[PDB]
């Protein structure tokens, strides 16, 4: 039973490690290679940044939280870590969303949009993503104890204390996952159906890649987002193990992003391999 507790820090730790290394390779390979420095890859840059913060901070602090048995760092950095994590994860999702939009417009408007869209617009949509994420999550997270008048959070554990109140939990969760997944999936549907007219290559490859992307986003972000809804009705409903796995499943999206967006392109991987030796 003593072997058990090290294996988890090895798996989660090495997964975090792989995460940050991967996204660092994304950022590096974009700044180094001038050919892949297209407007579409700026969104990949912002994405890899969010996934980097997530990779190094969220993953390791949650690794600590889980491996110790409690949150020993205090209310200040609990509120902090949670605010940060939720904000930058929402930022990741909004990034994916804005990527979806961009790809839709690149498909429907095949010649006009790619020229009309400038770098300034990309920076604007990125900033919009981060700002909206921050506004939607941060103020509600920290000041939920100043408004209620009591920190509902237990001394040992560290969770968002608006979870007890379903009314806000739903509204925040849907604007973070449900609404955005609906949007992404629907305009990706528009992409697949409008782009490529059994269909030999176009519809085949498009449907394949789109499927992989959507499957990733869902398989990672859904379990927690549906468990957050489960626990909002009943407190003893969900086992802490399953909860932990929901959290981690959410984290590994930020690990798999350089595989669905970057490496799914042919050149990116070639650019990656030189960083080895």
């Amino acid at each position, epitope marked *: 039973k003593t072997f058990e507790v090290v294996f988890i820090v090895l798996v989660a730790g090495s997964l975090s490690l792989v995460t940050i290394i991967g996204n660092i390779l994304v950022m590096v390979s974009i700044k180094v290679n001038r*050919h*892949l420095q*297209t*407007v*579409n*890859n700026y969104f990949l840059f912002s994405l890899a940044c969010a996934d980097l913060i997530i990779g190094v901070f969220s993953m390791n602090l949650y690794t600590l939280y889980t491996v110790i048995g409690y949150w020993p760092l205090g209310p200040v950095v609990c509120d902090l870590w949670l605010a940060l994590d939720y904000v930058v994860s929402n930022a990741s999702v909004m990034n994916l969303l804005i990527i979806s939009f961009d*790809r839709y417009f*690149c498909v429907t408007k*095949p*010649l*006009t949009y*790619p*020229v009309k869209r400038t770098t300034k617009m990309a920076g604007m949509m990125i900033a919009a993503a981060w700002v909206l994420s921050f506004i939607l999550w941060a103020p509600a997270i920290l000041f939920w104890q100043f408004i209620v008048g009591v920190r509902t959070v237990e001394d040992g554990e560290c969770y968002i204390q608006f979870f007890s109140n379903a009314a806000v939990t739903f509204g925040t969760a849907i604007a973070a996952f449900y609404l955005p997944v609906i949007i992404m999936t629907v305009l990706y549907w528009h992409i697949s159906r409008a782009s*490529k*007219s059994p269909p*030999p*290559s*176009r519809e085949k*490859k*498009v449907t394949r*890649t789109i499927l992989a992307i959507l499957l990733a986003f869902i398989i990672t972000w859904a379990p927690y987002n549906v468990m957050v809804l489960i626990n909002t009705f009943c407190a003893p409903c969900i086992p802490n193990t399953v909860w932990t796995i929901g959290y981690w499943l959410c984290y590994i999206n930020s690990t798999i992003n350089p595989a669905c967006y970057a490496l*799914c*392109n*042919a*050149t*990116f991987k070639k650019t990656f391999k030189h960083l080895l030796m």
Partner: nanobody, 121 residues
Framework: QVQLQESGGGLVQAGDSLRLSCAAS???????????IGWFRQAPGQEREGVSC????????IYADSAKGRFTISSDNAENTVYLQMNSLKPEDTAVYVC???????????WGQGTQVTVSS
């Protein structure tokens, strides 16, 4: 990797026709089939507007609202070289014609160097 060279750049009087040809090369683990190719013209100081675009894999033709009816595009899938023939030109088509190749979702984006097409009268 791929770099794209153009041809057919010359002088023509109004009403005449030209054939600009774009040749792509240098494929490894990627296929010319995996690239959708378009023609962009640039007038002096004006926006780099896109004339026409073709997908060789599907054979799907997509033209711009300005060049519809005069311009025709196709290719040679085995030779990995595309052909754009334009007919009944006006002196308003005086520009440098460059060749672009986007992979799905614009990840691998390539441009050429371009050829000059000056129309007389």
């Amino acid at each position: 990797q791929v770099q794209l060279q153009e041809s057919g750049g010359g002088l023509v009087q109004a009403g005449d026709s030209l054939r600009l040809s774009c040749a792509a090369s240098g494929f490894d683990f990627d296929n010319f089939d995996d690239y959708a190719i378009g023609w962009f013209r640039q007038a002096p100081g004006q926006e780099r507007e896109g004339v026409s675009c073709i997908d060789p894999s599907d054979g799907s033709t997509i033209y711009a609202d300005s060049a519809k009816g005069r311009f025709t595009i196709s290719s040679d899938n085995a030779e990995n070289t595309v052909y754009l023939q334009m007919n009944s030109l006006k002196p308003e088509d005086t520009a440098v014609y460059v060749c672009s190749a986007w992979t799905l979702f614009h990840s691998d984006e390539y441009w050429g160097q371009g050829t000059q097409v000056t129309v007389s009268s």
